[PDB]
Enzyme design. Structure first.
Site, PDB file in Angstrom:
ATOM      1  CB  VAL A 197      -0.991   0.031   1.192  1.00 45.12           C
ATOM      2  CG1 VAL A 197      -2.007  -1.081   1.047  1.00 45.12           C
ATOM      3  CG2 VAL A 197      -0.255  -0.075   2.535  1.00 45.12           C
ATOM      4  N   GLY A 248       8.341   4.287  -0.682  1.00 45.71           N
ATOM      5  CA  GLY A 248       9.085   5.546  -0.651  1.00 45.71           C
ATOM      6  C   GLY A 248      10.437   5.444   0.029  1.00 45.71           C
ATOM      7  CB  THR A 249      12.672   8.146   1.404  1.00 51.73           C
ATOM      8  OG1 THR A 249      11.621   8.857   2.071  1.00 51.73           O
ATOM      9  CG2 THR A 249      12.983   8.837   0.082  1.00 51.73           C
ATOM     10  CE1 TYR A 250       6.656   3.603   3.035  1.00 50.95           C
ATOM     11  CE2 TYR A 250       6.545   5.980   2.643  1.00 50.95           C
ATOM     12  CZ  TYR A 250       6.048   4.698   2.432  1.00 50.95           C
ATOM     13  OH  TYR A 250       4.955   4.514   1.620  1.00 50.95           O
ATOM     14  N   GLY A 251      10.634   3.076   2.950  1.00 49.87           N
ATOM     15  CA  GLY A 251      10.772   1.673   2.544  1.00 49.87           C
ATOM     16  C   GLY A 251       9.514   1.162   1.858  1.00 49.87           C
ATOM     17  CG  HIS A 252       9.492  -2.004   0.229  1.00 50.65           C
ATOM     18  ND1 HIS A 252       9.498  -2.113  -1.147  1.00 50.65           N
ATOM     19  CD2 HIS A 252      10.793  -1.929   0.604  1.00 50.65           C
ATOM     20  CE1 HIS A 252      10.746  -2.093  -1.582  1.00 50.65           C
ATOM     21  NE2 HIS A 252      11.550  -1.978  -0.541  1.00 50.65           N
ATOM     22  CG  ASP A 271       9.284  14.587   6.500  1.00 52.39           C
ATOM     23  OD1 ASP A 271       9.081  15.596   5.784  1.00 52.39           O
ATOM     24  OD2 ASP A 271       9.425  13.444   6.009  1.00 52.39           O
TER      25      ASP A 271
HETATM   26  C1  LIG Z   1       1.201   4.160   2.297  1.00 50.22           C
HETATM   27  C2  LIG Z   1       0.430   4.415   3.561  1.00 50.22           C
HETATM   28  C3  LIG Z   1       0.162   5.718   3.929  1.00 50.22           C
HETATM   29  C4  LIG Z   1      -0.545   5.974   5.094  1.00 50.22           C
HETATM   30  C5  LIG Z   1      -0.986   4.921   5.889  1.00 50.22           C
HETATM   31  C6  LIG Z   1      -0.724   3.610   5.516  1.00 50.22           C
HETATM   32  C7  LIG Z   1      -1.203   2.463   6.374  1.00 50.22           C
HETATM   33  C8  LIG Z   1      -0.549   2.388   7.739  1.00 50.22           C
HETATM   34  N1  LIG Z   1      -1.133   1.904   8.802  1.00 50.22           N
HETATM   35  N2  LIG Z   1      -0.277   1.945   9.907  1.00 50.22           N
HETATM   36  C9  LIG Z   1       0.918   2.490   9.524  1.00 50.22           C
HETATM   37  C10 LIG Z   1       2.112   2.769  10.206  1.00 50.22           C
HETATM   38  C11 LIG Z   1       3.188   3.340   9.540  1.00 50.22           C
HETATM   39  O1  LIG Z   1       4.341   3.605  10.202  1.00 50.22           O
HETATM   40  C12 LIG Z   1       3.084   3.652   8.166  1.00 50.22           C
HETATM   41  C13 LIG Z   1       4.224   4.264   7.444  1.00 50.22           C
HETATM   42  O2  LIG Z   1       5.321   3.745   7.538  1.00 50.22           O
HETATM   43  N3  LIG Z   1       4.090   5.388   6.693  1.00 50.22           N
HETATM   44  C14 LIG Z   1       5.189   6.029   5.948  1.00 50.22           C
HETATM   45  C15 LIG Z   1       4.566   7.188   5.124  1.00 50.22           C
HETATM   46  C16 LIG Z   1       3.314   7.556   5.959  1.00 50.22           C
HETATM   47  O3  LIG Z   1       3.630   8.399   7.066  1.00 50.22           O
HETATM   48  C17 LIG Z   1       2.867   6.177   6.454  1.00 50.22           C
HETATM   49  C18 LIG Z   1       1.899   3.365   7.482  1.00 50.22           C
HETATM   50  C19 LIG Z   1       0.804   2.793   8.140  1.00 50.22           C
HETATM   51  C20 LIG Z   1      -0.012   3.358   4.347  1.00 50.22           C
END
Ligand SMILES: Cc1cccc(Cc2n[nH]c3cc(O)c(C(=O)N4CC[C@H](O)C4)cc23)c1
Lengths: 342, 266
Positions: A30, A33-37, A148
Site C-alpha cells: 500500500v 518511498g524513502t521510508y521503505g515498503h 517532517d
Molecule cells: C502508504 C500508507 C500511507 C498511510 C498509511 C498507511 C497504512 C498504515 N497503517 N499503519 C501504519 C504505520 C506506519 O508507520 C506507516 C508508514 O510507515 N508510513 C510512511 C509514510 C506515511 O507516514 C505512512 C503506514 C501505516 C499506508
C-alpha cells in the site's frame, strides 16, 4: 558463525518468529518511498481478523536511521502517535520489519476527497487539530521532534475500536547533527533562510499549514517544484500570503545565514497589500473567528514568537461549540474510500 | 535529551531492572567453570576493554556507558560460551554509537579500533591479533538486538548526579570525583539492579565522605529509601577493596583460558 556455540545458534533459529510464517502480505503493498515498503497484512492463524501495517525498512542491516526509529518507537506510548507492536529481524537477507496497527485513512487522502468535490467537517477539523497537537505535545515533552510533518504523515484510524483517532507517523528519526542542511510547502521560513537545526517551533509551523489546508482544502503555501536551503519561489509564496515581515516582527531575521540573499532578491513594497487576514477571507474563513486567531499564532513568522503545542491546546477555540471528539468522524459514516493495493 | 523524563514508563525500568536472585540463578551455568571471584574479575576486564574502545573512537562517556549495559544484559541471560565476548564488546560499542545522530563510526574505523586497542593495551590477555572482520560484527549485532528485545534507550547516573551537585552548590569540589565513582560502578552489577538516580546518590555520598564534606542535612531533605542507597554504598566500598587485591594484568590470561568454549557444528 564458527566461533558461536552451535546449540545456542540452532535453539534460537528454531524459536525465532519469521515475518513470512506469521503474516500474509504478498501482493498487498500500500506504500513505497524513502521510508521503505509498507504492506497491509492479516495474521495467518485465525486468532483475530484485524488489519496490520508491515513496514520493511529501506536498505539492509541496521542503519543509523533504522537504529534510532526502533530505539524511540520502543519507548513512545500515546494514543495519537502510531504504536510499534513488534520487530522482526530477518537473518537470511538482513532485513528489518516493523509491525503497527493498520490505519485506513490519512489527511492527504481526506483533504484530496474534499478538494476533488468540485461539482460534519467543522467539528471534524477542530478534533483533527486537537489530536495532532496532543500527539506532537507528547513527543515534544519527551524532546522528540518529528521534523517532517505533513498531511501524508497524519493517519486516521478506520472502523474498529479506535474509530476516527489521529495517529502521527513517520517521524524523521535520523538527521545528521540534528541538521536540515545535510515539496517545501510545510517548511518554516527560518529553514528556508538557512536555520542549522530543527526545533519544536518548526514542527508547530507545519501544524499551522495543515490547519489552514483543513479549513480551505488547499495548501496555504502551494508552490511549483524546484541541495541548498534557500528556495526563492517558496519564500515568495509565503510573503504573497503572509506579507513581508517588518523589523519589529522578526528582529533576529538579520542573524539568519541567507538574510543578505533575501534582501538582494526581495523588496517590502512587492507585498504591501498581502496579509493572512486577506488570504483567509478569500477562502471563506472569518478574521474575527477563534479558529483564525489561533491559526495566526501557529503561523507566526519569527519562531520565538510562535505558540507552543501546549498553549495551542489551551486555546479558547477548543472550548467553543462544537467541542472536539475522540472519534473525529463523530459517529457519522465514513465516506472516504479505502486505500488501494499496488 | 530524548525520553529524559520518562524513566518510570521506560523499557529500562519495566524490563531491564532485574531481580538479583534471577541474575544469580542464570549465572550458575558459567559458575561450573569459573569461581564467583573469577567471574567478577572477567566483568571488570571487559568493562575496561569497552572503555578503551570508546576512548579510541572518541565517543562521549554516556555512549560508552550504554555499550557496557548492552554487554551486561546479554551475559545476564546467556553463557559466556554462547558468543565470544571479544567479538561482543566492539559490537555493543558500534550499536550504541548508532543510537546517536551526532557523528558516525565507519566499518574500517571499528575494525581498526578493535585491532589496535587489543594489541597496544591488552596484549597481556591476548597474544594473537583481533581475528574477526566486519561480517562477524554485523551478525553478532542481530543476535544482540534480538536478545535485548530491541530495548536501546538506556538511562545512566550522570544526568541525575549533575542535577544533585548543582543543587548542593558543590560542582567544582565534588563533581569530578563523583563522576569518576559513577564510572567505577559499571565494574559491578549495580546498573541491572537499581534505578540510575539511586546509584548517583550513592556515588555522591561516597565522594562527600572521601572529601570530608558534611552533607547529612542535604541527604535528609530528600525523599528516598536510604536503605537501598546504603546497599549501593556498600557495593562501591567493596569494589575498591577487590580493585586493591586484583591484578588483571597477571591473572586474566589464565581466567580467560578457564571460560567455557563454544560447541562446534556437526
Ligand atoms: C502508504 C500508507 C500511507 C498511510 C498509511 C498507511 C497504512 C498504515 N497503517 N499503519 C501504519 C504505520 C506506519 O508507520 C506507516 C508508514 O510507515 N508510513 C510512511 C509514510 C506515511 O507516514 C505512512 C503506514 C501505516 C499506508
Amino acid at each position: 558463525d564458527d566461533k558461536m556455540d552451535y546449540d545456542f545458534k540452532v535453539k534460537l533459529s528454531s524459536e525465532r518468529e519469521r515475518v513470512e510464517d506469521l503474516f500474509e502480505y504478498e501482493g498487498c503493498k500500500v506504500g513505497r518511498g524513502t521510508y521503505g515498503h509498507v504492506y497491509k497484512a492479516k495474521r495467518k492463524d485465525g486468532k483475530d481478523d484485524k488489519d496490520y501495517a508491515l513496514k520493511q525498512i529501506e536498505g539492509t542491516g541496521i542503519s543509523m536511521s533504522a537504529c534510532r526509529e526502533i530505539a524511540l518507537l520502543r519507548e513512545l506510548k500515546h494514543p495519537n502517535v502510531i504504536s510499534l507492536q513488534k520487530v522482526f529481524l530477518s537473518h537470511a537477507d538482513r532485513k528489518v520489519w516493523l509491525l503497527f496497527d493498520y490505519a485506513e485513512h490519512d489527511l492527504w487522502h481526506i483533504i484530496k476527497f474534499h478538494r476533488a468535490s468540485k461539482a460534519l467537517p467543522r467539528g471534524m477539523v477542530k478534533s483533527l487539530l486537537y489530536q495532532i497537537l496532543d500527539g506532537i505535545h507528547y513527543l515534544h515533552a519527551n524532546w522528540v521532534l518529528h521534523r517532517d510533518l505533513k498531511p501524508a504523515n497524519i493517519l486516521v484510524m478506520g472502523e474498529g475500536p479506535e474509530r476516527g483517532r489521529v495517529k502521527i507517523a513517520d517521524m524523521g528519526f535520523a538527521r545528521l547533527f540534528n541538521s536540515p542542511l545535510k515539496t517545501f510547502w510545510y517548511r518554516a521560513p527560518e529553514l528556508l533562510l538557512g536555520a542549522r537545526h530543527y526545533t519544536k517551533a518548526i514542527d508547530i509551523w507545519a501544524i499551522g499549514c495543515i490547519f489552514a489546508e483543513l479549513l480551505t482544502s488547499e495548501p496555504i503555501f502551494h508552490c511549483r517544484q524546484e541541495s541548498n536551503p534557500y528556495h526563492h519561489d517558496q519564500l515568495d509564496r509565503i510573503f504573497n500570503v503572509m506579507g513581508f515581515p517588518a523589523d519589529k516582527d522578526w528582529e533576529d531575521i538579520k542573524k539568519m545565514p541567507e538574510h543578505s540573499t533575501l534582501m538582494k532578491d526581495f523588496r517590502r513594497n512587492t507585498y504591501t497589500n498581502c496579509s493572512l487576514i486577506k488570504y483567509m477571507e478569500k477562502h471563506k474563513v472569518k478574521p474575527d473567528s477563534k479558529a483564525f486567531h489561533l491559526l495566526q499564532k501557529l503561523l507566526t513568522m519569527d519562531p520565538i514568537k510562535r505558540i507552543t503545542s501546549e498553549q495551542a491546546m489551551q486555546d479558547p477555540y477548543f472550548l467553543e461549540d462544537p467541542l472536539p471528539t475522540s472519534d473525529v468522524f463523530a459517529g457519522c459514516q465514513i465516506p472516504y474510500p479505502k486505500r488501494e493495493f499496488l | 535529551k530524548a525520553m529524559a523524563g520518562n524513566f518510570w514508563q521506560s523499557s529500562h525500568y519495566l524490563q531491564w531492572i532485574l531481580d538479583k536472585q534471577d541474575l544469580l540463578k542464570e549465572r550458575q551455568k558459567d559458575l561450573k567453570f569459573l569461581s564467583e571471584e573469577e567471574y567478577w574479575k572477567l566483568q571488570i576486564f571487559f568493562t575496561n576493554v569497552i572503555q578503551a574502545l570508546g576512548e579510541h573512537l572518541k565517543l562521549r562517556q554516556q555512549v560508552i556507558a550504554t555499550a557496557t549495559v548492552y554487554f551486561k544484559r546479554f551475559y545476564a541471560r546467556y553463557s559466556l560460551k554462547s558468543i565470544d565476548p571479544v567479538l561482543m564488546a566492539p559490537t555493543c560499542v558500534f550499536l550504541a554509537s548508532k543510537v546517536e545522530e551526532f557523528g558516525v563510526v565507519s566499518n574500517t574505523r571499528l575494525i581498526a579500533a578493535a585491532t589496535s586497542v587489543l594489541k597496544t593495551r591488552f596484549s597481556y590477555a591476548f597474544p594473537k591479533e583481533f581475528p574477526y572482520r566486519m561480517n562477524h560484527i554485523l551478525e553478532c549485532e542481530f543476535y544482540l538486538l534480538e536478545l535485548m528485545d530491541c530495548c536501546l534507550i538506556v538511562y545512566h547516573p550522570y544526568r541525575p548526579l549533575l542535577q544533585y551537585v548543582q543543587d548542593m552548590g558543590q560542582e567544582d569540589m565534588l563533581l569530578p570525583l563523583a563522576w569518576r565513582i559513577v564510572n567505577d560502578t559499571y565494574r559491578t552489577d549495580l546498573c541491572l539492579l537499581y534505578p540510575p538516580f539511586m546509584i548517583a546518590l550513592a556515588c555522591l555520598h561516597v565522594a562527600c565522605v572521601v572529601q570530608q564534606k558534611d552533607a547529612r542535612q542535604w541527604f535528609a531533605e530528600l525523599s528516598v529509601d536510604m536503605e537501598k542507597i546504603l546497599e549501593i554504598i556498600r557495593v562501591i566500598l567493596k569494589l575498591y577493596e577487590q580493585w586493591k587485591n586484583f591484578d588483571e594484568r597477571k591473572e586474566m590470561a589464565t581466567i580467560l583460558s578457564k571460560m567455557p568454549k563454544p560447541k562446534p557444528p556437526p
